[PDB]
Each structure stands twice: as structure tokens, then as C-alpha cells.
Amino acid sequence: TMMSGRPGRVPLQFLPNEARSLPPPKLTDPRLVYMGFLGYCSGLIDNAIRRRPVVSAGLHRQLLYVTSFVFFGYYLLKRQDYMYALRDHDMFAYVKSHPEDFPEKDKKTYGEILEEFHPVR
Amino acid sequence: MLKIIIPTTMLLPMTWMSKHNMIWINATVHSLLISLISLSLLNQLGENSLNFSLTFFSDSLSAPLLVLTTWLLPLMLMASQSHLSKETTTRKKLYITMLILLQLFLIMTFTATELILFYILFEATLVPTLIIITRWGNQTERLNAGLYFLFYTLAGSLPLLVALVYIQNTTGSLNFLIIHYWSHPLSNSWSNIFMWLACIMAFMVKMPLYGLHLWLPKAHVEAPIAGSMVLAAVLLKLGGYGMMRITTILNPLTNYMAYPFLMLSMWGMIMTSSICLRQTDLKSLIAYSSVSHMALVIVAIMIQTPWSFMGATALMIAHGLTSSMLFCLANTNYERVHSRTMILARGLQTLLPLMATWWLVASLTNLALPPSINLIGELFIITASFSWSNITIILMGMNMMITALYSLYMLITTQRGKYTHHINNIKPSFTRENALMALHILPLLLLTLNPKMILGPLY
Amino acid sequence: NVLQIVRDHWVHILVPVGFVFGCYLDRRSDEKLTAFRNKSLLFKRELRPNEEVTWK
Amino acid sequence: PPEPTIRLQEDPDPEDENLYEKNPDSHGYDKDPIVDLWNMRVVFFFGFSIVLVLGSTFVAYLPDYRMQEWARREAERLVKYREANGLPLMESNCFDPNKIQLPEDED
Amino acid sequence: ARQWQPDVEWAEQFGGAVMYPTKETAHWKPPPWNDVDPPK
Amino acid sequence: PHGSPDWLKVGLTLGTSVFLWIYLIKQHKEDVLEYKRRNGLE
Amino acid sequence: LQYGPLAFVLGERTTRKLTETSKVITVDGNICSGKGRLAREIAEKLGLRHFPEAGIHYADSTTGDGKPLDVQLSGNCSLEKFYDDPKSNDGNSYRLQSWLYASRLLQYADALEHLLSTGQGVVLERSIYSDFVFLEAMYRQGFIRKQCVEHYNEVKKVTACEYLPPHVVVYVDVPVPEIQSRIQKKGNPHEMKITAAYLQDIENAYKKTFLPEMSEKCEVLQYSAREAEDAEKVVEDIEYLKCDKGPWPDQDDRTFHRLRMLVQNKLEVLNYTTIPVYLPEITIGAHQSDRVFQKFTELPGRKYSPGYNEDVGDKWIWLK
Amino acid sequence: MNPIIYTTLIMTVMSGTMLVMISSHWLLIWIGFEMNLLAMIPVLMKNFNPRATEAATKYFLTQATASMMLMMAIIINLLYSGQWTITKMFNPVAMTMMTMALAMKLGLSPFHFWVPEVTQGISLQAGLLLLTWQKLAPLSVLCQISQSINPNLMLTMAMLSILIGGWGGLNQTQLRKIMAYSSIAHMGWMTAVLPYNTTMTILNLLIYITMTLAMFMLLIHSSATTTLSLSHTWNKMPVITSLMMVTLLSMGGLPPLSGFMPKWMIIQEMTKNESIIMPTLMAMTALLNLYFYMRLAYSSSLTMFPSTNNMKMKWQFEHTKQMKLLPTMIVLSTLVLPMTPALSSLN
């Protein structure tokens, strides 16, 4: 697809202004919960490497791990949703503007289609 | 489907936060509860399927496999309790974690509605098994065994992935429902021939097909008892389930692409069976018998008839239960004798009579004595093969005779005759071992009362 | 003794809570696919006087 | 050759331990008698009493969602109607040819 | 009654300069432990 | 060695977590309101 | 703020700490000589910090509580068994020699860290440099093999090539018959078993190999039993001489920073003492290794980092 | 060296890379490469010994030759079109020269010979920097001029790199050479997808950088540079060996780990361009990398090798310096497959 050269694109914008017309991901998004789970696993591994009681060594450190992962994951999800929206928008616009490349197929019914039959013997 | 998946995931924190002396009790109890919950999947329809969501669906082909998978976990825990006595708490928890992760991967693999999702979980099942084999295996060959079990598998499954993505660029979907409803014939072409081979070989290598089966004896004789149980009972059936699912897009090429494999199976089942006649290791004998039964399942799937599919499903379930029981019996001998050689411990019927009864029932079930579901599957496959070609009976008939021979051979060498004089450490059977055998054998004889549960979606 | 056996047997609630949460999760998925509820040609039906949806 | 013929400092191979020696009525589950007894009890109760009996009864009484008796009733009504009106039971064509448009060959 | 674990003879196959020694490589020597070569 | 709970680091970590959570919740609310205004929902 | 690159960048420079009296000093002599008293008196008079000679359980005295651990958890060797049966079947002799060399290396690192962190000098008994004499004697008496001394040489090379040799070497000279009389007077039944050959080879190694090589890069003060009684003249000799031939005047602030980062982080000091060279005297099988390591973990205060042990009385583990 | 000087040199390396990444003039890209090479040499030679000096001179000669040919390609491109902007290359000879120069800068086959020797000669920190950061600039330049590459040459060098890495890793007992050959194979995987999709190249680079950072930091924590030295780690810190085993399984492309994400995606992309044979061969050849990863896992954590007595002293001490972001690197290199569709962020 290569939307790097897409016209009207700001060189270093993480989320453009037009991205604000899309619904934001919910705070209970399953992907956000998975990001928080990744942060929790990072905290547990940090406890294990430093040779501390894994489950209950640093609660502030684990909370910061989870919170940072959730924050970055929320913004990443917003950007990903925006990029897929752009892809679909361009696809539909291109199909609309080139009708001779996407003709409407003349609908046919299985009663008037001759399909070959292969017996299983 | 999440009503089964979420408790299986919750098994992990329950295992890790358990007391040091209460891991086995809690794991066994909650695995049994999960099996009871999964029993509800057996209520199937004659219509399409139990399409829970966009990601998971259940069928009367998937439901018995799921029930077997959930039932095998408590038995594996009971079998592993003994030889893991002198192990540290953390490593025991890691062992239980590997078993739980394997169960989770299998559960999801059977119910996945997408071919790519199925491939990912079908490969994810490899890592726990490899760790179990190469970490808690006993002999030094385990490392080599693990390597075989890995690379064979991967050598078959890397082409499949390619084919899969290729298919999704042509049809536009890998969802099984859409794939079934929008199926189109495969024209006889070299490209189509290689696509067929790519779609078939990954499932052939895990059955295993004769000539591609060299990994299985190594892996099964080198694995710990729980690893052997899960490998023989469930992991072999992944190839059968995959071939049953994927053959819908391979017609009418299968009409003539199946010839090399059919021969390789029909002759192969003879060879492996004859191999069982001259074997000095119990586990090796049981593994080769598994190869013979799976060759019959391969023939059933390649024939592609309703009776063939019914027989293949029934035989898969029956073989899973029977081979798991046989491996457990062999291990209960090994933990007393520490040899794994058939002719060392002899005349055990005199010293352990109830275990001899368990041996007899397991041998009878492996021998396909009617009306066991083993014989139901075997007879349906044989009838379908006879319709395919009347000459097949010859080979099929021969296999039957040979099977009985080696089965009774294994029963006579270990249980009958005179006891070995210098072996004086054969203690009475524990309640745990007897309960393990009973929990293996009662479901088989119960299932013979309602065979429709294990006859698949073409019943 | 309560508040002492809890510290050892709180583990036994994890799997049943997972089961209840899984059932609740399954119900949520069902709501999303209601695109054809009471719209199939086979089960198309007129609603009862005090019925809002045919299934849940 | 003053070598000790010892390759390294290694523990001797321990002898296997008999569970019956320190505890008759051992049940083979654990070396702790209480934990062993309760492991036996939970295994037996949740395997034989709960799953094997109640689950088998549940499977036996599963409602007919496969619709076998429904198909039997439908077939009975169809056979009655067709024998009453002289129709020839099952028909050779699954779909009536009035709705199939075959292609003209004109060869 | 004991699980097999690698011993010195098993551990020595990974102590060479390379795996799969050949006639040409037979004279190769592993690098020093501190990766320092005497000034000579 | 022999060390007490460093109250400075604990306070900074907890404050950072709380600030991030409040900022995230405020940002989500503003996003929802702006999306509704742009699409004329509410 | 523990020492590191940031402390060096902002304020920490160790060159201003030196005050002409740092002068790491090592005192050497044969078995049961008076060198310990002389070193203690030198430290007392010069204001330096004395380091008692490193034994089997020197590392135990620096970690956790200073109490020694069990022999099978720390050292796996004994001096009394070496005195009773030096030609041991189990190769204990070289195990003891290697463990003592590692302990001396750790103690030298600790002394260097103290000197570089405070500027106060330290006084030591037999250091890593003088450690080799025992190995040589043990070889000439047939107690150890040649492979053992080769392994010792490799380890000593890769470890001792990274430290500054002592400024002053103080050697006490005592005759072998007089020292044998001293052993007789000591009364330790295990020490009464040392043959005169062992002492003679110790002295021969000291004189022929260790003294002249230290005379080429340090200042050496060879003293006898009588003239070591008065430490006043010893201290006068210590102050009178000036160090101008050793590598210490060559050192600068950057090299001091590198060596100070090396002397802390004891795991880097001890890194090459466990090179994968499989000699039967020191290599340990996997099963015994696992058992002993699990046993070590069981001991209180060893399961979790020093401040994270509830059994030891540690508090606020969750918030640390 | 002095910490101030070391920080300045590291910042100069990063600034040269960023100058390559942000400039639109060929001369400025060349200047960025020159600045990076100039500041890189002392970092390799930080711990002075003959091996480090030899590695530094080998690296200098290779990079100087590559930069000279890059300047030649720029001058030929300017000759045939008065252009300085980094765009379409306007000349086949100049583009072949540029591709070869960037291939030698990256270490793609047949210009792979310097990577194992340079990595073995330098320490583990210098190897970490060399194998992670020193790939950004040439790959960014290749991404900018992807539409002009001759696909035959690029695919030939990529397949050769995969084969050479797989075969050369089988023979190694030194961990740094194992990392070098793994890097060569991953570079081949990255460059095999440039003609079709640069987003796939960037995604593969990110995943590889995460995995390499995790493995190098694990090797630094357990200060081992050989197989036998790494076989002793279980007797001091078994957690490190278990984490390294999972990371090695991920590096082999085994699902459901993170290392499966690039190959999968790349294969898919190639299939979309009617390319079937090459991805098949690529996966078959990555099996070799997986084999020697598995051998390392066997010797490291899945079995217990003999130990030494002096290890007991090491039981009494803890690591003084803890590397931050190591747990995050491990988690990111093992458990990010469910987040695969995030690649649309054009990472």
C-alpha cells in the first residue's frame, strides 16, 4: 500500500487532526487489557531477576509498569485504528472513481449454472 | 467456549499460589471439574455446528476430542505424582504449568474456526511437549528424541503455512464455514498437485504416516509417563482432525493423489504390526501399535466416505484411551523394576492379580474385541475399504490376526509363566495406580453404550 | 477457623470464578451478532404482546 | 598413575524409597499420611462419584437436538400421504426440473 | 533410579574452538579466557 | 544492605502512576466528546 | 549514591584522597612465623587498617551475618584433613589451595576498595602474589598433580593481571628447625604432622622465586625473627623508603576510576575463578551441585536479596 | 576511557545515524555515515587488547571501502542527472554500486565475512551496539530507494545471507559468533522483503532489535562468552537460563512467540506478489538457525552440566548493577504476537 507519500500528511504527527472523527477505543478494550497483562508480566520478571519475592516485592513498581503499558497501548490502538480507517477510505474512493475497473457482476443463480460433478467412489 | 478456556487459564495462578503440599490435590480436583463442564459440549445438532462466536465453534467431530483432552489432564497428574516426589516445589509447579499450557493450546486448536489460528495453536502445542520430553525425560537419548519430534513436525508444517496464506490470497478467506460453503474443484495441474502436497504432508507427518514415523518411537520411549500419555492420546489425533477439515478443498484431486499414501498405509500397517512381534521394549511395542492404528485412520480419511469418517472418529477416540492405559501399565511396571525390558519381570499375575486383570482388559480392548468402540471403528473402516476395493480385505484381515498375536504376546510374556527369582522388590499395587487404570477403562465400556457420541458429524 | 483457613483455601475460588466470568463473556459475544434475530426466513415470527426479543 | 580414578565429586545414586515401610495404608499418593488420605478421597469422589456417574447420567438424558424422532415423524407423515394418494414414495429428482435451466448443446 | 545428566565427557564436546573438528581445524585453539593475547 | 523504604522514590512512582491514570481518563473523555460532536451524535 | 560513572563525573576523584600514607603493605613468612604480630603492630603504629589473613570462611564474614557457614556449603575443604592425609584420594589438597586463592583474591579486592574509597592504607598477610609458594611446596611433596598447578597458573594469570602490586613487601625470616620447635610448642595435634621437607620447599619457593620478582617492582624489607620484635625500626624503614619504581606513580585518575569500578562488583572479581576446566579435584557433578545449591537457598537470609528476607526480620518488602 | 568522552562518542554515533535518517541530500547522508564510522572506532576499542584493535581495523577497512563506493555511486548518479536528492536512482550502474555499498555496510552476503570476526574481537557491549544500532542507517537508505532496486540482486543477496547464516551458525561454540551469524540471517530476511513492502522490513528490524537486545543483556548479566561458560549459569541463577531459553525459542521463529511474527508476515507479503518458491526455501533454511538455538538451549537450561567448587563463593554475592529495560525487552521479545495487527502504525 505504501501510504508514506500520501498527500496532505504531516511529517512527524503521531495522530493527525482528522483522526479525531473516529470513536476512541474503550478503556475495557481486550487489547488494552492484554497490554496491561504485558506490563504485569514485565513487573514480575523484574522482581524475579532482581531476586525479590516475585508476587509481592514492589507494588508501586508493578503499578507503574502496568500503567505505562496501558498508556502507550491506548495511544498505539488509536493510531492503528486511524491507519486502517485511512486504508478503507482510500480503497472505497478509488473504487468509486474507477468504475470501469470494478464492474458489477451479472448475478447468476445456481439453477442456471452448470457445475461439473465428481463422484466419490 | 470461554466457559472452558477461562478456568483452564485460572489453573495456572491456582497452581502457583498453592501450598507446597497441596498442588496435586487442587490441580486434580479442578481439572476434573473442568472436564465435567466440558461434558456439555456433547449436545450436538444434526445441523451445521455450535458456532459460539467468530473465533470458536464446536462440532460433533471436535466435541469428543475436547472431552478426551480435558479428561486426560487429571490422569496425567495422577501418573506424574509418583516419579516427581523428590523434585523441588518450583519445578513441580513448572511441570504442572507445562501440562496446563498444553491443554489450553489443544482446547483452542480443536475449536478454532480459522485455518491460520488453527495452524498457530497446532504449532504452539510443540513447545510444552518438547520441554517436557527434554527436561523431565530419564535417559540421555531424550535430547535426540526431542530434536526428531521437532524437526520432522516443522519440516511438514512450514509448507502448509505457505499454502494457507496462498489460499487466503485466492479465495479471500480461511474461515472454515466460508471455505466449506464456497468450495471449488481442484483441476489436475502441477501447481494444484504441489498445493495438495503442502496441505497434506503436515498432517501426514503427525499421524504418523508409515515412512515418516521414525520420530514417534524415539519420542514415546524417551518421554516421561505424562508426555507419553498426551502424545499417544491427543497429539496424534491433531493430524487426523486437520486432514478431516482440509480435505474439503482438495477434491477431486484426492481421487488420485491418495494412491501413494493409501499403499504406504495398507502395507505399512502390516510392517509395523509385524515389528511388534519382535520387540524387546514395552513402550516401543505400544508406540508401534499406535502407528498401525493410525495407518488405519489414514486409510479411512483418504477413502472419503461417510462410513470411513465415522470409523476414523471412533477409532481415534478408542485408540487414545487404550494407548494411554497401556502406557500407564508399562510405567507402573517400570517404576518397580527400572528396566523397561519385557522379559525381565515375568509371571506378574501371581504377584499382582488385579493389575493382571487391568492388563487383560487393556489387551482385549487393543485387540478390538466386540462390542468395544475400537472394533466399531475398525469394522466401519474395513467395510468402507471393502467398498473402495474388495481386495483390501486381504491386507485388513492380515492386520487383524497379527494385532491379536502381538497383543496377547505382550500379555503372556509379562503376566504368565514363572516369576523372576531375584526380583524381590515388587510391592503391592497402590490405590493410585488401580484408580488410574479404572478411570482409563470405565469410560471406554461406558462409551460402547452410546456410540453415536463418538461417530462424528456424518452420523 | 475463619480468617486463618482463608489464607490457605482462598485458592479454591479461582477456577469457579473463572467459570462464571467465562459464561458472562460468552453472553457478551452473543449480543454483537443479533443482526438477524427474528429475521431468518425459517424462524421469522410475530412478537408476543409482552416480548421484545425472540432470544437473548 | 596416582590419579584417583574419580572423574568428579558426585553424590551416590540413592535407593528407591518404599511408601509402605513408613506408612502402611499408604494409598500411594503422598508420603504425608493426612495429605495422602485426602488426595485419595478427593480423587475418588470427583472422579467416580461426580464425573463418572453424574456426567454419564447427564449424557444419557441429553435432549434430542439431533432430531431423530422428529425425522421419524416427518417420514411417517410423508409415507402416509404418498401411499394414500398413490404417489411413488421417494422421487428420483431431489430438485424439480422446472427450476433448472440446462444449457442447450445444439451439437 | 536417577535421571541422566551431562558429565565431563559429555561436556567436553562443546569445549573446542568449533563444533565438528576437522584435520585443518584440529590445530585451532580456543581464545583465552580474558580474551587477551600475551604481548610476546 | 541495611536500607529503609525510600519514601522519595515510592512517592514519585505512585504520583507518576496516579498522574498517568488521571491524564488517560481525561483524554478518553475528551476524545469521546469530540467524536460525538464531530459526528453529531449527542 | 553508589560509586559509578555519574559520581566520577560530578565530584568523585580518588587522587585527592591519597596522602602519601596509603602504601598498601603485605607481610609474608613461613608457617607459624611472627608475621601476624608484626603486621598488626605496623597497622597500629602507622594508622593503617589491618586485614587478618584470609581463611576458608573469609567470604562468609563479609556477607549476610559474619558467622561462618557449613563446610559443605562454603569451601568444601579442610586444613586438618590436608595435614592428616595430604596425599588424599579425593584431591582435597588442590580444592583447599584453589579455595584459599579465591579467598585471597576477594580479600585483596576488598582492601583495594577500602584504600581507593577512603584513602586510608591497609596491611595484609600473604596476598595472591605470595599464594603460589604453598602450591609449589604441595607439588614438590607429591600432594597434587601437574594439571592442578597448570590450572592454578591459568587462573592466577587471568586474575592477578588486573591489580596493582603492593608498595612494600615485609618478609620475616625464621629457620626451619626453629619454626619446627615453634610448631612443637603450639600443641595443635594436626600441625605436629608437617614434615621438614614441606617447610623447606615453602622457604625455597619464597626465597628463590617470590623475593627477587617482587624486588624488581616494589621495595622489600627482609627481616629476621630477632629484629622483627621491635616494630619501631620497621616503621622507620617504611617511612624512609620512597616508592618510585612501581606502577603506582604511573596511575592517574582515570585508571583509578577503572580499578575502583573493578574492586567493587565482587562477581566480576571472582569471574575467572570458575573457568570451565574440568579437573577431578574441583569439578562437581550435577546432582550434588543441585542438592548443595538448594541447601544453600534454604539457609535464612539467603533466599532473597539482603533487604528482602522476612525470616531475617526485613520489613516493607512490598514497598522496597 | 573517560565517561564524558564515552558519552560524547556515543552521542556522536547516534547523531551520525540521525543525520543519515533526516537528510534529503546525498552529501549529507554520506557525511552522516562518515561521522558514524569516525565515532564508532573508539567504542569498539574501549577495552584495549590486540583482538579489539584487530577488529577495529577490519571494521574500518570494510566501512571505508563501502563509503568510497557510496560516494562513487552518488557521483555517477549526479553525472547522469544533476540531482542530489535521495530519490529514484536514475542509473542502473550507479544503483548497483549503491546496493553493493549498502550491502557491505550491513554485512549481507557475500560481504558477510567481517561480521563474525568483528563481533568476536570486541566485547559484549560493543557487540550489542554494533549488531543493533549500526543497522538503522543503511536500512533506512535502502527503504528510501526501494522502488529502484533491481529485485534479482537484492533477492540473491538476501537468500545467500539466510543460507550463509544458517550454515555458519552450526559450527560455532563462541556465543558472539553465533550472534553474528544470526544477525546475518535476520538481515537476509529483512532485505528479502524490501522490493515489496518496506513496512515489513521495519517490523522485522524492530522485532530483531528487541530480541538481540534481550539476548545480549542476558549474556552480559551472566558474564559468559562461550557455550561451556554459559553451561555454568544454572548453578548460580537458573531464572536467567530459563528466560534465555524462552528467548532462544522465540528467536527460532517458533509460534506463539514474538519471533514468528516477522517471517509469517513476510511470507504473506511475498505470497501476495506471486512469489512462492523463495519463502518456502527461506523457512526451510531458517530451520538451521532454530537447530543451533536449540543446541544452545540444550546446553544451557534443559540439562544440568557439571559445576566447579569455587562457584560456592559466587553464591554469596549479588549483581551490583542492574540493567533497566531487560524485563521489558524479554516480554516484548516473547509475548507480542496477539498484538500483531498493530503493524499498521507503520512502525
Ligand SMILES: CCCCCCCCCCCCCCCCCC(=O)OC[C@H](COP(=O)([O-])OCC(O)COP(=O)([O-])OC[C@@H](COC(=O)CCCCCCCCCCCCCCCCC)OC(=O)CCCCCCCCCCCCCCCCC)OC(=O)CCCCCCCCCCCCCCCCC
Ligand atoms: C496462552 C498462554 C496463557 C498463559 C500465559 C503464560 C505466561 C504468563 C506469565 C509470563 C511470565 C510472567 C511471570 C513469570 C516470572 C518468573 C518468576 C518465576 O520464576 O516464578 C517464581 C514464582 C514463585 O517462586 P518464588 O517463591 O516467589 O521465588 C522463587 C524465585 O523466583 C526463583 O525460584 P528458583 O530459582 O528457586 O527456581 C529456579 C527455576 C525458576 O525458573 C522459572 O520459573 C522462570 C520462568 C520461566 C521463564 C519465563 C518466560 C517469559 C514469558 C514467556 C512465556 C511463554 C509462553 C508461550 C507458550 C510456551 C510455553 C513454554 O528454574 C528452574 O528450575 C530451571 C528448570 C527449567 C524448567 C523448564 C523451563 C520452562 C520455562 C517456560 C515457562 C513458560 C510458562 C511459565 C508460567 C509462569 C512461571 C512462573 O512464581 C509465582 O508465583 C508468580 C507466577 C505468576 C503469579 C500469579 C499471581 C496472580 C493471581 C491473582 C489472582 C488471579 C488473577 C485473575 C484475576 C481474577 C481473580 C478475581
Ligand SMILES: CCCCCCCCCCCCCCCCC[C@@H](O)O[C@H](CO[C@H](O)CCCCCCCCCCCCCCC)COP(=O)(O)OCC[N+](C)(C)C
Ligand atoms: C519417504 C517416506 C514417505 C514420504 C511420503 C511419500 C508421499 C509423497 C508422494 C508424492 C505423490 C505423487 C506426486 C505426483 C503424482 C501425479 C501423477 C504423475 O506423477 O504421474 C504421471 C506424470 O508423469 C511423470 O510422473 C512426470 C513427472 C516425473 C518426475 C517426478 C519424479 C518421479 C519420482 C520422484 C520421487 C521422489 C520423492 C521424494 C522427494 C525427496 C501422470 O502422467 P501425466 O498425464 O503426464 O501428468 C498428469 C499431471 N498433470 C495433469 C499435472 C500434467
Ligand SMILES: CCCCCCCCCCCCCCCCC[C@@H](O)O[C@H](CO[C@H](O)CCCCCCCCCCCCCCC)COP(=O)(O)OCC[N+](C)(C)C
Ligand atoms: C461388577 C459386578 C456387577 C455389578 C453391576 C451389576 C449391574 C449390571 C449393569 C451394568 C451394564 C449392563 C448394561 C445395562 C444398560 C442399561 C443402561 C442403558 O440403557 O443406558 C444407556 C445410556 O448410556 C449413556 O448414554 C452412555 C454413558 C456416557 C459416557 C460418557 C463418559 C463420562 C465422562 C468420562 C470422561 C470422558 C472420556 C472419553 C471421552 C470421549 C443407553 O440408554 P438409551 O437407550 O440410549 O436412552 C436413555 C433413556 N432416554 C431414552 C430417556 C434418553
Ligand SMILES: CCCCCCCCCCCCCCCCC[C@@H](O)O[C@H](CO[C@H](O)CCCCCCCCCCCCCCC)COP(=O)(O)OCC[N+](C)(C)C
Ligand atoms: C517488540 C515490538 C516493537 C517495540 C518498539 C519499541 C517500543 C517503545 C517505543 C515508544 C514509542 C515510539 C513512538 C515515538 C512517538 C511519536 C512518533 C511519531 O512522531 O512518528 C510517527 C511514526 O510513529 C511510529 O512509526 C509508530 C511506532 C509504534 C510501534 C508499534 C508497532 C509494533 C508492531 C506490532 C507488535 C506489537 C507491539 C506492542 C507492544 C509495545 C510518524 O512517522 P513518519 O515520520 O510520518 O514516517 C516515518 C516512518 N515511515 C517511514 C515508516 C513511514
Ligand SMILES: CCCCCCCC/C=C\CCCCCCCC(=O)O[C@H](COC(=O)CCCCCCC/C=C/CCCCCCCC)COP(=O)(O)OCCN
Ligand atoms: C516430512 C517432510 C515433508 C516436507 C514437505 C513436503 C511437501 C512439499 C510440498 C511442496 C512445497 C511447496 C508448496 C507450495 C505452497 C503451495 C502454493 C501453491 O500451490 O502455488 C503454486 C506454486 O507451486 C510451486 O511453485 C511449488 C514448486 C515446488 C518448489 C519447492 C520444492 C519442494 C520439494 C518438492 C518435491 C517434494 C514434494 C513431496 C515430498 C514428499 C515428502 C518427502 C502455484 O503458483 P502460481 O505461480 O502462483 O500459479 C501458477 C499459475 N501462474
Ligand SMILES: Nc1ncnc2c1ncn2[C@@H]1O[C@H](COP(=O)(O)OP(=O)(O)O)[C@@H](O)[C@H]1O
Ligand atoms: N595456601 C595454603 N595452603 C595450605 N595451608 C595454608 C595456606 N595458607 C595458609 N595456610 C595455613 O594457615 C595456618 C595459619 O597460618 P600461619 O601464617 O602459618 O600461622 P599464624 O597465622 O598463626 O602465624 C597455617 O596452619 C597454614 O598452614
